[PDB]
Structure formats: C-alpha cells, structure tokens
Amino acid sequence: MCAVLRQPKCVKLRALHSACKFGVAARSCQELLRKGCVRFQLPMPGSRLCLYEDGTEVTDDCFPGLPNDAELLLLTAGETWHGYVSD
Amino acid sequence: MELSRGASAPDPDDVRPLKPCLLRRNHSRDQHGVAASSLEELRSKACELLAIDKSLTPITLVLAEDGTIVDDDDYFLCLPSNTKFVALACNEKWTYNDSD
C-alpha cells in the first residue's frame, strides 16, 4: 500500500544530549523514521522517539498523527523524556 | 516549453524552482546568494563559494536562525528563496555553542 500524500511531511530530529537536531522532511512517515535512525543510530523496534513538547511516545504508527515539523526527540527503549516542563 | 505545464503532466513547475539561499562561513560575516533547487545544487555552490574542501566533509548546514542541522534535501527547500545557511565544513564554529 503506497498511500499518496498531498505534500512532503516535515519533522525535527532533536537528541537529548546532542544539543542539536536534524530537520528533515519526506512523503513517507516511515522514510523519515529510517533517516533518523541512520543519523542517530536508533532502530524503530529497539528504539523510539518522544515529542519534545509533552514527552509523547512516537513511532511508525503514531508519527503521522503529528502535524508537520514534529519535535521528534531521541529516546531508546530505556530512557524517557520528562516533557517540556514549566517548573 | 510552450506546452501548458502548470499542474498536468510530470515535471511540475513547483519542483524546486531554484532556491536562492544565503550561504555563510563562520569566521567571516559574509553571506552569498546561491540559486540551488535540490540540496546537491546548494551544497556544491557552498563549496565553490565558501571553498569547503572535500576534506572538511561531511559538511553541516545548520540554519543560523534556529540551528537545525539540514543533512537532508526535502525540508530545506520550504523556506522562501532566501535563508541564512551556516556551512560547517567540520571546522567552522557551530551556531549553537551551548547557547540554549
């Protein structure tokens, strides 16, 4: 199944201790998941991501649910992102 | 080219209509207007304009405004025909420096 999208999605791959991120887009939520795991070395199964807005776990099934440039933070199966706290 | 091409037939007109980005090399407050559609086109221009030797690659294009690394070619063509692209040939100072 190759669902044809209307426009290339957009997201920002930000790491936790990298002090930087990887802005990249694509017409396939899955395609982005790979490039991110290739530049950050983070497999989908043994490694996922979490919205940097509220620490929302994101993967290849809940990534497209986010708008364009989705703050995708790096999160392996072991650490969790507290979430943009205001304390 | 007179063939009516505004949406029908492949080779659309909005296929990266040249993106005149402004490349800048750290240690030198000098921006350069470079018309490039796909990243490959921009990168090269930044190499001949900033002299990014191939020994400094992989180069890192981080936006001077935000600093997001642009190591792709599907999200850096959205900005208007003009953006501050800080070229970092694995040497130029980064646009972050713990500046959170």
PDB file of all heavy atoms in Angstrom, chain A residues 63-84:
ATOM      1  N   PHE A  63       3.430   8.532  14.407  1.00  0.00           N
ATOM      2  CA  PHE A  63       4.241   9.696  13.951  1.00  0.00           C
ATOM      3  C   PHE A  63       3.423  10.603  13.011  1.00  0.00           C
ATOM      4  O   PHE A  63       3.426  11.807  13.182  1.00  0.00           O
ATOM      5  CB  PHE A  63       5.458   9.084  13.240  1.00  0.00           C
ATOM      6  CG  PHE A  63       6.014  10.055  12.222  1.00  0.00           C
ATOM      7  CD1 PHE A  63       7.149  10.814  12.529  1.00  0.00           C
ATOM      8  CD2 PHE A  63       5.395  10.195  10.974  1.00  0.00           C
ATOM      9  CE1 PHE A  63       7.665  11.714  11.587  1.00  0.00           C
ATOM     10  CE2 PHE A  63       5.911  11.094  10.033  1.00  0.00           C
ATOM     11  CZ  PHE A  63       7.046  11.853  10.339  1.00  0.00           C
ATOM     12  N   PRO A  64       2.746  10.018  12.047  1.00  0.00           N
ATOM     13  CA  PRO A  64       1.935  10.826  11.103  1.00  0.00           C
ATOM     14  C   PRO A  64       0.807  11.547  11.846  1.00  0.00           C
ATOM     15  O   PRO A  64       0.252  12.514  11.362  1.00  0.00           O
ATOM     16  CB  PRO A  64       1.378   9.771  10.145  1.00  0.00           C
ATOM     17  CG  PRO A  64       1.890   8.386  10.579  1.00  0.00           C
ATOM     18  CD  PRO A  64       2.746   8.549  11.843  1.00  0.00           C
ATOM     19  N   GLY A  65       0.464  11.085  13.016  1.00  0.00           N
ATOM     20  CA  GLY A  65      -0.628  11.744  13.788  1.00  0.00           C
ATOM     21  C   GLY A  65      -0.202  13.163  14.166  1.00  0.00           C
ATOM     22  O   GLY A  65      -1.018  13.996  14.510  1.00  0.00           O
ATOM     23  N   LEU A  66       1.070  13.447  14.108  1.00  0.00           N
ATOM     24  CA  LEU A  66       1.545  14.815  14.466  1.00  0.00           C
ATOM     25  C   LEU A  66       1.553  15.715  13.224  1.00  0.00           C
ATOM     26  O   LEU A  66       1.674  15.234  12.115  1.00  0.00           O
ATOM     27  CB  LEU A  66       2.968  14.615  14.993  1.00  0.00           C
ATOM     28  CG  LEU A  66       2.981  13.466  16.002  1.00  0.00           C
ATOM     29  CD1 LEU A  66       4.368  13.361  16.639  1.00  0.00           C
ATOM     30  CD2 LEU A  66       1.940  13.733  17.091  1.00  0.00           C
ATOM     31  N   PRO A  67       1.424  17.000  13.450  1.00  0.00           N
ATOM     32  CA  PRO A  67       1.416  17.976  12.334  1.00  0.00           C
ATOM     33  C   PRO A  67       2.739  17.924  11.565  1.00  0.00           C
ATOM     34  O   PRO A  67       3.469  16.956  11.632  1.00  0.00           O
ATOM     35  CB  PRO A  67       1.254  19.315  13.060  1.00  0.00           C
ATOM     36  CG  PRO A  67       1.175  19.052  14.576  1.00  0.00           C
ATOM     37  CD  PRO A  67       1.280  17.542  14.822  1.00  0.00           C
ATOM     38  N   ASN A  68       3.054  18.962  10.837  1.00  0.00           N
ATOM     39  CA  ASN A  68       4.330  18.975  10.068  1.00  0.00           C
ATOM     40  C   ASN A  68       5.519  18.858  11.030  1.00  0.00           C
ATOM     41  O   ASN A  68       5.490  18.068  11.945  1.00  0.00           O
ATOM     42  CB  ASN A  68       4.341  20.325   9.348  1.00  0.00           C
ATOM     43  CG  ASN A  68       3.052  20.482   8.541  1.00  0.00           C
ATOM     44  OD1 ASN A  68       1.967  20.389   9.082  1.00  0.00           O
ATOM     45  ND2 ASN A  68       3.123  20.721   7.260  1.00  0.00           N
ATOM     46  N   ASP A  69       6.556  19.636  10.811  1.00  0.00           N
ATOM     47  CA  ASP A  69       7.772  19.600  11.681  1.00  0.00           C
ATOM     48  C   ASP A  69       7.437  19.176  13.114  1.00  0.00           C
ATOM     49  O   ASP A  69       7.274  19.997  13.994  1.00  0.00           O
ATOM     50  CB  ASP A  69       8.294  21.037  11.670  1.00  0.00           C
ATOM     51  CG  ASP A  69       7.137  22.004  11.929  1.00  0.00           C
ATOM     52  OD1 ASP A  69       6.138  21.568  12.477  1.00  0.00           O
ATOM     53  OD2 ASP A  69       7.271  23.164  11.575  1.00  0.00           O
ATOM     54  N   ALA A  70       7.333  17.898  13.352  1.00  0.00           N
ATOM     55  CA  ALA A  70       7.010  17.417  14.725  1.00  0.00           C
ATOM     56  C   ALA A  70       8.292  17.273  15.549  1.00  0.00           C
ATOM     57  O   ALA A  70       9.208  16.570  15.170  1.00  0.00           O
ATOM     58  CB  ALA A  70       6.347  16.054  14.522  1.00  0.00           C
ATOM     59  N   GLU A  71       8.366  17.933  16.672  1.00  0.00           N
ATOM     60  CA  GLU A  71       9.591  17.832  17.517  1.00  0.00           C
ATOM     61  C   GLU A  71       9.834  16.374  17.921  1.00  0.00           C
ATOM     62  O   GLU A  71       9.412  15.933  18.971  1.00  0.00           O
ATOM     63  CB  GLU A  71       9.295  18.686  18.749  1.00  0.00           C
ATOM     64  CG  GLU A  71       8.881  20.092  18.310  1.00  0.00           C
ATOM     65  CD  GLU A  71       9.445  21.120  19.293  1.00  0.00           C
ATOM     66  OE1 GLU A  71      10.419  20.805  19.956  1.00  0.00           O
ATOM     67  OE2 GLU A  71       8.892  22.205  19.367  1.00  0.00           O
ATOM     68  N   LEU A  72      10.510  15.625  17.093  1.00  0.00           N
ATOM     69  CA  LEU A  72      10.777  14.197  17.430  1.00  0.00           C
ATOM     70  C   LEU A  72      12.089  14.073  18.210  1.00  0.00           C
ATOM     71  O   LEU A  72      13.165  14.154  17.651  1.00  0.00           O
ATOM     72  CB  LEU A  72      10.886  13.485  16.081  1.00  0.00           C
ATOM     73  CG  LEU A  72       9.792  12.422  15.974  1.00  0.00           C
ATOM     74  CD1 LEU A  72       8.420  13.099  15.963  1.00  0.00           C
ATOM     75  CD2 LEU A  72       9.980  11.629  14.678  1.00  0.00           C
ATOM     76  N   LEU A  73      12.008  13.874  19.498  1.00  0.00           N
ATOM     77  CA  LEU A  73      13.251  13.743  20.311  1.00  0.00           C
ATOM     78  C   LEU A  73      13.760  12.300  20.269  1.00  0.00           C
ATOM     79  O   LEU A  73      13.016  11.377  20.005  1.00  0.00           O
ATOM     80  CB  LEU A  73      12.836  14.125  21.733  1.00  0.00           C
ATOM     81  CG  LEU A  73      14.085  14.382  22.579  1.00  0.00           C
ATOM     82  CD1 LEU A  73      14.615  15.788  22.293  1.00  0.00           C
ATOM     83  CD2 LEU A  73      13.728  14.265  24.062  1.00  0.00           C
ATOM     84  N   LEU A  74      15.023  12.099  20.528  1.00  0.00           N
ATOM     85  CA  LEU A  74      15.578  10.715  20.501  1.00  0.00           C
ATOM     86  C   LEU A  74      15.278   9.998  21.821  1.00  0.00           C
ATOM     87  O   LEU A  74      15.453  10.548  22.890  1.00  0.00           O
ATOM     88  CB  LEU A  74      17.085  10.897  20.321  1.00  0.00           C
ATOM     89  CG  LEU A  74      17.660   9.693  19.574  1.00  0.00           C
ATOM     90  CD1 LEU A  74      17.216   9.739  18.111  1.00  0.00           C
ATOM     91  CD2 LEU A  74      19.188   9.734  19.644  1.00  0.00           C
ATOM     92  N   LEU A  75      14.826   8.775  21.754  1.00  0.00           N
ATOM     93  CA  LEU A  75      14.515   8.025  23.005  1.00  0.00           C
ATOM     94  C   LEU A  75      14.638   6.518  22.762  1.00  0.00           C
ATOM     95  O   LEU A  75      13.846   5.926  22.058  1.00  0.00           O
ATOM     96  CB  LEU A  75      13.071   8.396  23.341  1.00  0.00           C
ATOM     97  CG  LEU A  75      12.670   7.740  24.664  1.00  0.00           C
ATOM     98  CD1 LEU A  75      11.610   8.596  25.359  1.00  0.00           C
ATOM     99  CD2 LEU A  75      12.098   6.348  24.388  1.00  0.00           C
ATOM    100  N   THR A  76      15.628   5.894  23.341  1.00  0.00           N
ATOM    101  CA  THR A  76      15.799   4.426  23.142  1.00  0.00           C
ATOM    102  C   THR A  76      14.951   3.652  24.155  1.00  0.00           C
ATOM    103  O   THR A  76      14.425   4.214  25.096  1.00  0.00           O
ATOM    104  CB  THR A  76      17.288   4.165  23.380  1.00  0.00           C
ATOM    105  OG1 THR A  76      17.571   4.273  24.768  1.00  0.00           O
ATOM    106  CG2 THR A  76      18.118   5.188  22.605  1.00  0.00           C
ATOM    107  N   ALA A  77      14.813   2.369  23.971  1.00  0.00           N
ATOM    108  CA  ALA A  77      13.997   1.561  24.923  1.00  0.00           C
ATOM    109  C   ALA A  77      14.694   1.491  26.285  1.00  0.00           C
ATOM    110  O   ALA A  77      15.244   0.473  26.659  1.00  0.00           O
ATOM    111  CB  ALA A  77      13.910   0.172  24.291  1.00  0.00           C
ATOM    112  N   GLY A  78      14.675   2.563  27.028  1.00  0.00           N
ATOM    113  CA  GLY A  78      15.337   2.555  28.364  1.00  0.00           C
ATOM    114  C   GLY A  78      15.211   3.938  29.004  1.00  0.00           C
ATOM    115  O   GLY A  78      14.999   4.065  30.194  1.00  0.00           O
ATOM    116  N   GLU A  79      15.338   4.978  28.225  1.00  0.00           N
ATOM    117  CA  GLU A  79      15.225   6.352  28.791  1.00  0.00           C
ATOM    118  C   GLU A  79      13.929   7.012  28.315  1.00  0.00           C
ATOM    119  O   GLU A  79      13.427   6.720  27.248  1.00  0.00           O
ATOM    120  CB  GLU A  79      16.440   7.105  28.247  1.00  0.00           C
ATOM    121  CG  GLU A  79      17.696   6.254  28.436  1.00  0.00           C
ATOM    122  CD  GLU A  79      18.933   7.154  28.408  1.00  0.00           C
ATOM    123  OE1 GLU A  79      18.877   8.223  28.993  1.00  0.00           O
ATOM    124  OE2 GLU A  79      19.915   6.759  27.802  1.00  0.00           O
ATOM    125  N   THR A  80      13.382   7.903  29.098  1.00  0.00           N
ATOM    126  CA  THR A  80      12.118   8.579  28.689  1.00  0.00           C
ATOM    127  C   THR A  80      12.266  10.098  28.809  1.00  0.00           C
ATOM    128  O   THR A  80      12.974  10.597  29.661  1.00  0.00           O
ATOM    129  CB  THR A  80      11.058   8.065  29.663  1.00  0.00           C
ATOM    130  OG1 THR A  80      11.531   8.208  30.995  1.00  0.00           O
ATOM    131  CG2 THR A  80      10.770   6.590  29.377  1.00  0.00           C
ATOM    132  N   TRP A  81      11.603  10.835  27.962  1.00  0.00           N
ATOM    133  CA  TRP A  81      11.702  12.322  28.027  1.00  0.00           C
ATOM    134  C   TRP A  81      10.621  12.882  28.955  1.00  0.00           C
ATOM    135  O   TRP A  81       9.443  12.810  28.665  1.00  0.00           O
ATOM    136  CB  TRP A  81      11.481  12.795  26.589  1.00  0.00           C
ATOM    137  CG  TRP A  81      11.184  14.261  26.580  1.00  0.00           C
ATOM    138  CD1 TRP A  81      10.300  14.869  25.757  1.00  0.00           C
ATOM    139  CD2 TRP A  81      11.753  15.311  27.416  1.00  0.00           C
ATOM    140  NE1 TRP A  81      10.289  16.224  26.034  1.00  0.00           N
ATOM    141  CE2 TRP A  81      11.169  16.545  27.049  1.00  0.00           C
ATOM    142  CE3 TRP A  81      12.710  15.311  28.448  1.00  0.00           C
ATOM    143  CZ2 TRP A  81      11.520  17.739  27.681  1.00  0.00           C
ATOM    144  CZ3 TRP A  81      13.067  16.510  29.086  1.00  0.00           C
ATOM    145  CH2 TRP A  81      12.472  17.721  28.704  1.00  0.00           C
ATOM    146  N   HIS A  82      11.012  13.439  30.069  1.00  0.00           N
ATOM    147  CA  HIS A  82      10.005  14.003  31.013  1.00  0.00           C
ATOM    148  C   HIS A  82       8.960  14.820  30.247  1.00  0.00           C
ATOM    149  O   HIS A  82       7.771  14.649  30.427  1.00  0.00           O
ATOM    150  CB  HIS A  82      10.806  14.903  31.955  1.00  0.00           C
ATOM    151  CG  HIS A  82      10.444  14.586  33.380  1.00  0.00           C
ATOM    152  ND1 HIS A  82      11.184  13.704  34.151  1.00  0.00           N
ATOM    153  CD2 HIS A  82       9.423  15.025  34.186  1.00  0.00           C
ATOM    154  CE1 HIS A  82      10.604  13.641  35.364  1.00  0.00           C
ATOM    155  NE2 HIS A  82       9.526  14.426  35.439  1.00  0.00           N
ATOM    156  N   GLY A  83       9.395  15.706  29.394  1.00  0.00           N
ATOM    157  CA  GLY A  83       8.427  16.530  28.618  1.00  0.00           C
ATOM    158  C   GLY A  83       8.652  18.011  28.929  1.00  0.00           C
ATOM    159  O   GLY A  83       9.080  18.371  30.007  1.00  0.00           O
ATOM    160  N   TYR A  84       8.367  18.873  27.990  1.00  0.00           N
ATOM    161  CA  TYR A  84       8.564  20.331  28.232  1.00  0.00           C
ATOM    162  C   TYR A  84       7.902  20.744  29.549  1.00  0.00           C
ATOM    163  O   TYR A  84       6.746  21.120  29.583  1.00  0.00           O
ATOM    164  CB  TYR A  84       7.886  21.022  27.050  1.00  0.00           C
ATOM    165  CG  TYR A  84       8.174  22.504  27.096  1.00  0.00           C
ATOM    166  CD1 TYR A  84       9.412  22.990  26.660  1.00  0.00           C
ATOM    167  CD2 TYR A  84       7.204  23.391  27.576  1.00  0.00           C
ATOM    168  CE1 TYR A  84       9.679  24.364  26.702  1.00  0.00           C
ATOM    169  CE2 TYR A  84       7.471  24.765  27.620  1.00  0.00           C
ATOM    170  CZ  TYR A  84       8.709  25.251  27.183  1.00  0.00           C
ATOM    171  OH  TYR A  84       8.972  26.605  27.225  1.00  0.00           O
TER     172      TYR A  84
END
